[PDB]
Amino acid sequence: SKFGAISSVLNDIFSRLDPPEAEVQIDRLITGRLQSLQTYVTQQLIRAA
Amino acid sequence: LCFTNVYADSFVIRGDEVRQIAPGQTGNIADYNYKLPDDFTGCVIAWN
């Protein structure tokens, strides 16, 4: 999932973009994936209960 | 603000070459004369 960024591949962000906003794109992707993993863990906790 | 120590770098370049002085920006001056690190904090001054 692109999560609002321009690419779903980190190396694409590296090559096709210069660092200063490549950092912004990486931050967006990282926070999106962290949210996904948080959601998975929360649902696992409820199901475990 | 109050800084620890300030380093001033002075030189002269061409008119269109001014864009090359930037973090993560490549070019003849950048690759062979003067390259700014990406984690660069500071001002750059250019006047004709």
UniProtKB/Swiss-Prot annotation, chain A:
Q: What does altering S15A do?
A: In strain: Alpha/B.1.1.7
Which top-rank group of organisms is this from? Answer: Viruses
Main role? Subunit of the fusion protein that is processed upon entry into the host cell. Mediates fusion of the virion and cellular membranes by functioning as a class I viral fusion protein. Contains a viral fusion peptide that is unmasked after S2 cleavage. This cleavage can occur at the cell membrane by host TMPRSS2 or during endocytosis by host CSTL. In either case, this triggers an extensive and irreversible conformational change that leads to fusion of the viral envelope with the cellular cytoplasmic membrane, releasing viral genomic RNA into the host cell cytoplasm.
The protein, known as: Spike protein S2'
Organism expressing this protein natively: Severe acute respiratory syndrome coronavirus 2
